[PDB]
Subunit: 219 residues, 6 copies
Amino acid sequence: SHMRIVFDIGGSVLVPENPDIDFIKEIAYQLTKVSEDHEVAVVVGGGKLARKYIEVAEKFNSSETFKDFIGIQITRANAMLLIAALREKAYPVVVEDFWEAWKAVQLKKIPVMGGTHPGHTTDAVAALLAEFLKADLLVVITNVDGVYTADPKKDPTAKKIKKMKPEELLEIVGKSVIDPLAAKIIARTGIKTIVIGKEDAKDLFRVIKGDHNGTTIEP
Amino acid sequence: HMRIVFDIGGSVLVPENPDIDFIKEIAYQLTKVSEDHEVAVVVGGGKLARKYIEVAEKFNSSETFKDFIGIQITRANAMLLIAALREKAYPVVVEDFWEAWKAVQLKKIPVMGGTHPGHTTDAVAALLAEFLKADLLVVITNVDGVYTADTAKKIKKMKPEELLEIVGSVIDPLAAKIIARTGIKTIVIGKEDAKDLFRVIKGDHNGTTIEP
Amino acid sequence: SHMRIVFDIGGSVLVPENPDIDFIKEIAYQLTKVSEDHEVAVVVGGGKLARKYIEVAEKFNSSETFKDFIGIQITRANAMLLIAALREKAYPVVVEDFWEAWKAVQLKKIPVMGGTHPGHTTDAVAALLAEFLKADLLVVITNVDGVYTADPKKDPTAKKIKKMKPEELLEIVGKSVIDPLAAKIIARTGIKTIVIGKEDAKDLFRVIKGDHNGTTIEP
Amino acid sequence: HMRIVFDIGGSVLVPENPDIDFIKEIAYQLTKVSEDHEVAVVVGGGKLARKYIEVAEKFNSSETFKDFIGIQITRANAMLLIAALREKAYPVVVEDFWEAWKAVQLKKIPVMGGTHPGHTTDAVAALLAEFLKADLLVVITNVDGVYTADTAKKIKKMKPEELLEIVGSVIDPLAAKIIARTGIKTIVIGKEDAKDLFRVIKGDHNGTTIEP
Amino acid sequence: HMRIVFDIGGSVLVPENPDIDFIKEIAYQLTKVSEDHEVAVVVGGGKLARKYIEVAEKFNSSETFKDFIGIQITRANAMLLIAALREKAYPVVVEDFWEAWKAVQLKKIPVMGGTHPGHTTDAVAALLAEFLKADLLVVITNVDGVYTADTAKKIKKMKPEELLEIVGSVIDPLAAKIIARTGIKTIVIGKEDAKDLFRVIKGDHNGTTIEP
Amino acid sequence: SHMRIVFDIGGSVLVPENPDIDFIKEIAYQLTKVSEDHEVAVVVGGGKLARKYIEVAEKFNSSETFKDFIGIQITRANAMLLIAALREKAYPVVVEDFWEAWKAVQLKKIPVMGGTHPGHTTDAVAALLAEFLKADLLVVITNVDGVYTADPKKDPTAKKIKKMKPEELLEIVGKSVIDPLAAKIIARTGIKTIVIGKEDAKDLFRVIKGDHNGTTIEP
Ligand SMILES: O=c1ccn([C@@H]2O[C@H](COP(=O)(O)OP(=O)(O)OP(=O)(O)O)[C@@H](O)[C@H]2O)c(=O)[nH]1
Ligand SMILES: O=c1ccn([C@@H]2O[C@H](COP(=O)(O)OP(=O)(O)OP(=O)(O)O)[C@@H](O)[C@H]2O)c(=O)[nH]1
Ligand SMILES: O=c1ccn([C@@H]2O[C@H](COP(=O)(O)OP(=O)(O)OP(=O)(O)O)[C@@H](O)[C@H]2O)c(=O)[nH]1
Ligand SMILES: O=c1ccn([C@@H]2O[C@H](COP(=O)(O)OP(=O)(O)OP(=O)(O)O)[C@@H](O)[C@H]2O)c(=O)[nH]1
Ligand SMILES: O=c1ccn([C@@H]2O[C@H](COP(=O)(O)OP(=O)(O)OP(=O)(O)O)[C@@H](O)[C@H]2O)c(=O)[nH]1
Ligand SMILES: O=c1ccn([C@@H]2O[C@H](COP(=O)(O)OP(=O)(O)OP(=O)(O)O)[C@@H](O)[C@H]2O)c(=O)[nH]1
């Protein structure tokens, strides 16, 4: 059993306020173990640091495009922290485009990406990566349990949906755990996607076998 | 007086093959418009991009790689406009926004093609309009304007919000999101009205005006 | 027997009017088989699409240099179609310079090039590639049988010359199957070159053993 | 009349978090100064760069990779200034000297961050001042000026040679070497004097003036 | 009034070592010429490039890699001219044509070296003249002009066609092909006439004039 | 015993007047042998050619920065001569940044660097490379025997110090075989450094075992 997996690590999980060192350390260990039997690629988000800086740029009335560029820039500094945690198993530099990630995987090294272009999120970056690498699996480690019928941190009636088809995720994301564009990419290619939180992330070996309490999305 | 971004649909510039005289005309008009305003242009892929994408589809290429092929074709198309724009154009096809910005500083018309998988040239033009803080975004597509359907009806004016509903193709969602998020005044016209850009940018057109 | 081979696939063969899907598919299979025992690199031309677009640029009186750039751009879109046909065996992106092709070969992947610079053709690109990689063989798959004393599609007395030395090819190309610069490169390094048409291209395994009806050029 | 290079310490722009109003002010003043002189700016990393560097340290990352992380953070900081500088700034963060040179030709303020492992933004600003043959180099750090120690004393004026001794941190050695090697007139002031750049560049300041 | 491209032979700029005063002079004249015309320059490799190429030859390096070494040396030589051209030169060595184009827009003299294996700086200058639609191409080589042989004879005027025959070295074939294909007015002079470029570009010279 | 080694080959040794072909040939052989058992990376300096060209730029009163750029440019032409001598064992192009050197080492090829940035020397480039690659050893082959208490080509009392700690080298370089910045890098990471001349360079196998008459610097 040898699969190719893309992990989309949410910026808020990686950097809630300041970088969460314990989680970085722990997820790096997990990723490292999984990389022993599978080809692993990674995309990380911006988190609190990205929101601070973007908010500063907002006070100077900068364009929404320049603000995206700032967030992207912050996601790459974050990606560097994971690369550091992955030690010798990581590709040494933040990967900025898909074919470069492909190369890293050829060299049996783990490529870690940050954002790529204005208009979308690292979620979209992760989906396109998975699509490009023809990954068997896309694992989204976010700050919520899985996919709910409503925002679980707010709406009391929010119920978790264990399994859905890409179309379901599209409805839900429109009515969000995942960004729309990312949702469209997952739906156009039929990328098998798992959405889990920090708890399940503690054991990626089990997660990739389907043993988790998150949400599984597939055609 | 104005900073304008023109989004020329691929099917309009290259219906089957390249529409020679139309390219000559749009190039000429774009030139006149640039004497009075700052011009930037993004060109689509058209039928040619679909042919090449279909070929890759036959080899079960991933959707991401197909996007890259379409992008490559949109740049080939852009080179045709750059050629028609002669000395008033920025020599090479622009691949990123600040590059378009440098061209504007040099008083040269930058012509972009696509940029990244996942979206279309509309998104490119939208993000370009937004990056440059353009006053106007002109979308020249294969449809007469924005209809309430594919017996539909054409909506003269509407707000960014209403544009997001309708798109739920005429314009891709990402592009509609960029337009709403920033409130970019946008005009959607067909090949017919594109035959007189000079007047189109002054309200004289029978297309659709999307504005906050 | 492990050789390093550079294949120069003519644009007119790859795209006679529209892309010739059957030939692309077939040559990709052949290239794939040859790559099992040898290191394969590929360069492709522009064809009909390149002539259309270049001709459009001519109507706008653009420089001959800008027109070359357009042809190059079209050859890269063509190269992408072959990359697609080569599937997992191909280097994912159009290679734009020789050392990048070298890398692809290091990764046991097939690099596919398009044009590189104004002033010459993909033939020259292929010759320089072969020279750079120190290839044992340069195979030119064009739209003619091999090298003739005159244009075979026109002159009735055109006779095919089975074997010649680089000097011969130079005379012939001056008095063309191959572009002059490409001819000069083949002559300065003494690159063993085979010139065949579509028919012989159906079996590259046989072609590289010398079993073909084309022309062989070597010192 | 003058070509000036400003070196803004990371701790000054980002003490803990970004100092909003200070950024607004320095951005405003830099803008006024640019009406009369050619301006170029290099921004440091501050506390944020140290946090991120410390994290990498915890994973025993090499010193070279830590330098790369600090550099990445200095560019994030530079984007904040570029934002505050609005349309008078060069859009992207400048990564090499001739790039800064192009920005100057375009009458836009280039804002650089770090560039290479082994040194700091002071060296970047010094080499930038030198590359551009700038008339003045203004160093805005967290210290009042150049003291004979960390009861030390502040030295009003001194020569490049004497600056090399003192640094044997206020300013990194490589930067001091570049300043001496070329004889770049340099002014070292603190956050206090930075509150009125317009006068600082005219001698009115209580910092240190290093000059041959 | 005119857009001119100068092709300075490597042996002329670097006979054995760099010809200091000659570089100073050609740099000075190029500067004067640029006050009245748009100037672009391409520099060769000379004896130095041959030394380095010969060394690689000793290790049986491929001809392609030798070309890359010669190219690298031609850029080293170009940096010497850029240095002599001072503030009127584009800071970095130009590696591609549109880059030279940007320099021209900035009113700075771009100085290119070689660009691709397979040809020489003559081809680079020819393609540059062609890309820029230059009115004149001035070739400064080690020979007095274009002779009917290596008792030969010098041909005052000739047409592109006749230049292609003669080259079948003074000028490389690719360059001759570019000159003919486009009909670039070309002047071929030696180090002697290069001592007064200002007059050379006005017909006053005893070299050869290749023109359609 | 498999170590990772960075060799800093002084420009004056590689090019004393004109390129020293015999030394290039000989050191390439040595480097090639060492690369059979270890991961080898290389940085080379400018030498006489770099000083000539820099001096020409001085006569035109160019900035010290532009002069550095010229020296860097010359070091890369020099690096190409070594690459040529290393034949098939070398990475085909002059490496310009550390992660690219990392890649070359992944491909079991020898990367050869020239200068990288204004302000320092190839010595600093070598030290940062070693630091980046986490090399076990940095070997400096310069034009002097090892580290002396004074300039050995001038001061009669110059005595060679066989062993010292990074702090020692810092004092000495301040009061130079090695450039200050390079010295600071060696001291901040504690890079084990050996400083030898041409004589000892004739047998790198012995040098890396500690059998040499040069200077060894380590914490
Ligand atoms: O490819 C990319 C990545 C990131 N970004 C920009 O950087 C920011 C961070 O990128 P994230 O991927 O973390 O965005 P998110 O919106 O899902 O972030 P949170 O709300 O959960 O904090 C986003 O706000 C986006 O604008 C891009 O523009 N493009
Ligand atoms: O930024 C871009 C631009 C273009 N493309 C890719 O290139 C192709 C052409 O890009 P277009 O912008 O022309 O697409 P369109 O689908 O809107 O085209 P028509 O249907 O009217 O014919 C599209 O199919 C898209 O996938 C990208 O992936 N990214
Ligand atoms: O490296 C390159 C490749 C291609 N090109 C440019 O692109 C075009 C296509 O490149 P080809 O290699 O297909 O040219 P060809 O001349 O042998 O083409 P046909 O006549 O057989 O159709 C050529 O016309 C050339 O100008 C370059 O300028 N440089
Ligand atoms: O060119 C550069 C710039 C910066 N950096 C790296 O980025 C970091 C921040 O770069 P700074 O220029 O802010 O460093 P500083 O150490 O002088 O910072 P403070 O102590 O006052 O907080 C530094 O730690 C340095 O290693 C480089 O490696 N190279
Ligand atoms: O674009 C270029 C330029 C130069 N070169 C390579 O660099 C070298 C120097 O480039 P030159 O343009 O000086 O060559 P030249 O041969 O005409 O030189 P001389 O004989 O008069 O001494 C040449 O030997 C060539 O191979 C290229 O390969 N491509
Ligand atoms: O990374 C680099 C490398 C080199 N250089 C520049 O190129 C030149 C050659 O680089 P070297 O590394 O050979 O300098 P060196 O000072 O130790 O040279 P010698 O005195 O022994 O001859 C140096 O003078 C330097 O200015 C840089 O600026 N940066």
